[PDB]
Design an enzyme around this catalytic site. Structure first.
Site, PDB file in Angstrom:
ATOM      1  N   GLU A 263       0.878  -1.283   0.037  1.00 19.36           N
ATOM      2  CA  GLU A 263       0.028  -0.128   0.081  1.00 19.36           C
ATOM      3  C   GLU A 263       1.055   1.259   0.036  1.00 19.36           C
ATOM      4  O   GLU A 263       0.442   2.427  -0.334  1.00 19.36           O
ATOM      5  CB  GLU A 263      -0.913  -0.099   1.325  1.00 19.36           C
ATOM      6  CG  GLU A 263      -0.207   0.108   2.673  1.00 19.36           C
ATOM      7  CD  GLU A 263      -1.060   0.398   3.868  1.00 19.36           C
ATOM      8  OE1 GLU A 263      -1.182   1.373   4.239  1.00 19.36           O
ATOM      9  OE2 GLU A 263      -1.567  -0.755   4.251  1.00 19.36           O
ATOM     10  N   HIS A 295      -6.569   2.872   4.637  1.00 15.31           N
ATOM     11  CA  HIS A 295      -5.857   2.837   5.907  1.00 15.31           C
ATOM     12  C   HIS A 295      -6.311   4.321   6.465  1.00 15.31           C
ATOM     13  O   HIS A 295      -5.419   4.837   7.071  1.00 15.31           O
ATOM     14  CB  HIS A 295      -4.444   2.968   5.921  1.00 15.31           C
ATOM     15  CG  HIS A 295      -3.534   2.279   6.784  1.00 15.31           C
ATOM     16  ND1 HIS A 295      -2.820   1.005   6.675  1.00 15.31           N
ATOM     17  CD2 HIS A 295      -4.117   2.087   8.036  1.00 15.31           C
ATOM     18  CE1 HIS A 295      -2.592   0.600   7.767  1.00 15.31           C
ATOM     19  NE2 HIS A 295      -3.034   1.197   8.949  1.00 15.31           N
TER      20      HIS A 295
HETATM   21  N1  LIG Z   1      -6.692   1.091  11.034  1.00 16.95           N
HETATM   22  C1  LIG Z   1      -5.467   1.883  11.318  1.00 16.95           C
HETATM   23  O1  LIG Z   1      -5.562   2.816  10.787  1.00 16.95           O
HETATM   24  C2  LIG Z   1      -4.144   1.543  12.126  1.00 16.95           C
HETATM   25  C3  LIG Z   1      -4.378   2.194  13.079  1.00 16.95           C
HETATM   26  C4  LIG Z   1      -4.241   1.975  14.778  1.00 16.95           C
HETATM   27  C5  LIG Z   1      -3.737   0.402  14.956  1.00 16.95           C
HETATM   28  N2  LIG Z   1      -3.466  -0.325  13.483  1.00 16.95           N
HETATM   29  C6  LIG Z   1      -3.067  -1.460  13.554  1.00 16.95           C
HETATM   30  O2  LIG Z   1      -3.893  -2.311  14.428  1.00 16.95           O
HETATM   31  C7  LIG Z   1      -3.197  -3.367  15.395  1.00 16.95           C
HETATM   32  C8  LIG Z   1      -3.371  -2.835  16.726  1.00 16.95           C
HETATM   33  O3  LIG Z   1      -2.902  -3.471  17.838  1.00 16.95           O
HETATM   34  P1  LIG Z   1      -3.361  -2.754  19.350  1.00 16.95           P
HETATM   35  O4  LIG Z   1      -2.222  -1.804  19.715  1.00 16.95           O
HETATM   36  O5  LIG Z   1      -4.828  -2.494  19.313  1.00 16.95           O
HETATM   37  O6  LIG Z   1      -3.427  -3.911  20.592  1.00 16.95           O
HETATM   38  P2  LIG Z   1      -2.101  -4.718  21.306  1.00 16.95           P
HETATM   39  O7  LIG Z   1      -0.839  -3.956  20.765  1.00 16.95           O
HETATM   40  O8  LIG Z   1      -2.282  -4.297  22.646  1.00 16.95           O
HETATM   41  O9  LIG Z   1      -2.071  -6.125  20.659  1.00 16.95           O
HETATM   42  C9  LIG Z   1      -2.886  -6.669  19.977  1.00 16.95           C
HETATM   43  C10 LIG Z   1      -3.350  -8.078  20.374  1.00 16.95           C
HETATM   44  O10 LIG Z   1      -3.037  -9.077  19.402  1.00 16.95           O
HETATM   45  C11 LIG Z   1      -2.647 -10.050  20.269  1.00 16.95           C
HETATM   46  N3  LIG Z   1      -1.850 -11.056  19.291  1.00 16.95           N
HETATM   47  C12 LIG Z   1      -0.496 -11.138  19.228  1.00 16.95           C
HETATM   48  N4  LIG Z   1      -0.011 -12.336  18.350  1.00 16.95           N
HETATM   49  C13 LIG Z   1      -1.376 -12.543  17.912  1.00 16.95           C
HETATM   50  C14 LIG Z   1      -1.097 -14.285  17.792  1.00 16.95           C
HETATM   51  N5  LIG Z   1       0.021 -14.511  16.972  1.00 16.95           N
HETATM   52  N6  LIG Z   1      -2.223 -14.467  17.209  1.00 16.95           N
HETATM   53  C15 LIG Z   1      -3.531 -14.357  18.064  1.00 16.95           C
HETATM   54  N7  LIG Z   1      -3.642 -12.952  18.639  1.00 16.95           N
HETATM   55  C16 LIG Z   1      -2.192 -12.362  18.880  1.00 16.95           C
HETATM   56  C17 LIG Z   1      -1.818  -9.666  21.181  1.00 16.95           C
HETATM   57  O11 LIG Z   1      -1.924 -10.522  22.183  1.00 16.95           O
HETATM   58  C18 LIG Z   1      -2.530  -8.455  21.590  1.00 16.95           C
HETATM   59  O12 LIG Z   1      -3.557  -8.618  22.785  1.00 16.95           O
HETATM   60  C19 LIG Z   1      -1.894  -3.192  14.910  1.00 16.95           C
HETATM   61  O13 LIG Z   1      -1.682  -4.195  13.870  1.00 16.95           O
HETATM   62  C20 LIG Z   1      -1.602  -2.095  14.212  1.00 16.95           C
HETATM   63  O14 LIG Z   1      -0.941  -2.236  13.191  1.00 16.95           O
HETATM   64  C21 LIG Z   1      -4.356  -0.063  12.501  1.00 16.95           C
END
Ligand SMILES: NC(=O)c1ccc[n+]([C@@H]2O[C@H](COP(=O)([O-])OP(=O)(O)OC[C@H]3O[C@@H](n4cnc5c(N)ncnc54)[C@H](O)[C@@H]3O)[C@@H](O)[C@H]2O)c1
Ligand SMILES: NC(=O)c1ccc[n+]([C@@H]2O[C@H](COP(=O)([O-])OP(=O)(O)OC[C@H]3O[C@@H](n4cnc5c(N)ncnc54)[C@H](O)[C@@H]3O)[C@@H](O)[C@H]2O)c1
Lengths: 332, 332
Positions: A263, A295
């Site tokens: 992307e 995104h």
């Molecule tokens: N949509 C958007 O514009 C953008 C902005 C915000 C967040 N991001 C993404 O969203 C995600 C955010 O994570 P977060 O900060 O909300 O929560 P977080 O960082 O607290 O962790 C996410 C959860 O995923 C779990 N996870 C890790 N390994 C995985 C395993 N291999 N399989 C099962 N699940 C397990 C972790 O245990 C954790 O509880 C990230 O991937 C980030 O890149 C997207």
């Protein structure tokens, strides 16, 4: 006391001026970026906040800041990859970011996207483009009768479940760690169970070697033919190729993609009648059942506000205290 | 016992047969609408249920239905509009309908289409077809950060509020009678207070000489310029020329219509290649921020099965009982 803020959007303006009020600190905005030309603009300021992808190389920058005596360089985004920590370090520049903005932003986008697919809306919209307004065979479902799989019940992943549970749906989640706070919200299960039971699967995990391509074609295999896939987290967590494959073959119903593989060479660019850099982008935009968003999950009034508020508070802390909870470097 | 069912669809079949199984009553089906020689179609049958728009004033059915021993006429929709009141009560024929089927069908459509708009998705999608992937200017809003006006908080109207309530919205309503059950969920205001305070304005009233053109030139000019209107109730409710003039002149930001002026003559027909009956419809299809659906609010598994169960248990009531809930009429 005053801060200068760079590369400021028109939607950020409301939020800044609320914080100007609150703290009684004066903040100045412009539409520039930080380069060795524009660093000279830091003159009458006690600190600075930036936003940009552009890697900032020229030591004339870290010098100039240090020379007008700013003790930090702050980014409002999650990423710091455009700031050189070493260069800041030797200039007495503490550099901070803003990793966590409201988990609701992304969440309600997972919700919206999902509902649309649940009501079979893209197909109505297709039929109705050609003025076929017939509703035959498009009967849809009610959320309370759906079971929503969440992989990575997170900050976000968790907020998502809570949303759906509240809507009446049934929420199961696959996670390597259980939160007690989610105890009345999700029932915790193995990835293999979730994929099998879930009408909607939504990916909230972080992008790691651990999780890269977590959805592999045998995981898509496992999913219900009428179930949908929602990926708001990160493109590579999904196998773009297997996705496409599953879709064509009707292994699953459809999908919502806020983030796609490769992307960086498309989303947030004017492609208007240029050519598309991803053969997958080209193949997915030709699939009827599949929605795509640049995104923008994040992009909401309250999320923009956090980046604006937090990044500025980090600037204050460094100035009054000398430390921020978000700092990525050292000095000597 | 045996009952003839009319105008049945593929989606209905599965829900029907499950009932046959449950009660051991035999229902024989067909895609026919009730008209003329369809009278004797009732021959061996002790009851009849219909789903159709076409009105019936002709007694050569009613006497048939009398003679063939049918004591009732039951509609599987909430509409009784196509049925005769004189001939009904005199011919031995009671008439019952289904007044309310699952209220979450309609609520959840307005929730979806609302969420879609709050997220600026039509503008995003519009840009993405141009292959313009830029998100600048499209910032969206969180549910908590919104005030959702409900006009007509009824069965459906009140379900909508509970929803937006659960998702954290500040929710205000407008009704001619206030339910206590909503004392905690909503704040009752006047129409003009509501149009002025609310970001989303959703209509739940029934069509009546009273509600017809409730949203008029004036009501629309009252709304926030960044607001949206969602009409899930009935076409006449909104004065459609005014609505158009208002989207055209950016008096409001967008709209979502599940029902339109004169839909009987266009919705649910393959008009592909043919010209459109309303210029009203022609014009609305070219406005960017507007979303049209062919009165698919009701249309979901639960609400379909609801229609079927209820209507048949209205019939078995008027046979194994002699009276049923939703009937309105008298005897010889
Ligand atoms: N949509 C958007 O514009 C953008 C902005 C915000 C967040 N991001 C993404 O969203 C995600 C955010 O994570 P977060 O900060 O909300 O929560 P977080 O960082 O607290 O962790 C996410 C959860 O995923 C779990 N996870 C890790 N390994 C995985 C395993 N291999 N399989 C099962 N699940 C397990 C972790 O245990 C954790 O509880 C990230 O991937 C980030 O890149 C997207
Ligand atoms: N979208 C679809 O596919 C379809 C299917 C279901 C419902 N229908 C429509 O939705 C509406 C359903 O109503 P309902 O059964 O959910 O609730 P309801 O029958 O209990 O009544 C609706 C509420 O509107 C209020 N209202 C009546 N006069 C209005 C006044 N003039 N102005 C302020 N509001 C007053 C009533 O007090 C009532 O509380 C109907 O108009 C119906 O036609 C849409």
């Amino acid at each position: 006391m005053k801060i200068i803020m760079f590369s400021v959007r028109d939607d950020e303006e409301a939020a800044i001026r609320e914080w100007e009020k609150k703290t009684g600190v004066q903040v100045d905005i412009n539409r520039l970026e930080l380069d060795a030309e524009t660093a000279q603009l830091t003159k009458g300021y006690d600190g600075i906040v930036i936003q940009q992808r552009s890697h900032i190389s020229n030591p004339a920058v870290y010098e100039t800041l240090q020379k007008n005596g700013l003790r930090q360089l702050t980014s409002r985004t999650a990423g710091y990859d455009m700031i050189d920590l070493e260069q800041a370090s030797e200039r007495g520049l503490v550099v901070t970011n803003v990793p966590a903005y409201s988990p609701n932003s992304v969440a309600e986008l997972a919700l919206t996207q999902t509902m649309r697919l649940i009501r079979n809306l893209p197909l109505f919209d297709a039929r109705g483009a050609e003025q076929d307004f017939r509703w035959a065979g498009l009967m849809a479902r009610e959320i309370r009768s759906l079971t929503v799989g969440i992989i990575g019940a997170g900050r976000i992943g968790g907020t998502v479940a809570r949303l759906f549970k509240a809507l009446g749906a049934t929420v199961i989640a696959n996670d390597i760690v259980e939160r007690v706070e989610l105890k009345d919200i999700v029932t915790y299960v193995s990835k293999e169970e979730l994929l099998q039971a879930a009408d909607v699967v939504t990916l909230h995990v972080p992008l790691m070697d651990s999780t890269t391509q977590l959805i592999d074609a045998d995981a898509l295999a496992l999913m219900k033919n009428d179930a949908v896939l929602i990926n708001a987290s990160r493109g590579p967590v999904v196998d773009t190729d297997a996705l496409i494959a599953a879709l064509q073959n009707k292994q699953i119903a459809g999908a919502a993609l806020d983030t796609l593989n490769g992307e960086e060479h498309f989303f947030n660019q004017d492609l208007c009648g240029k050519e598309l850099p991803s053969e997958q982008l080209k193949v997915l935009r030709t699939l009827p059942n599949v929605l795509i968003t640049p995104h923008i999950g994040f992009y909401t009034n309250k999320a923009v506000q956090n980046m604006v508020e937090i990044s500025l508070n980090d600037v204050l802390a460094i100035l009054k205290t000398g430390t921020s909870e978000h700092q990525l470097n050292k000095v000597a």
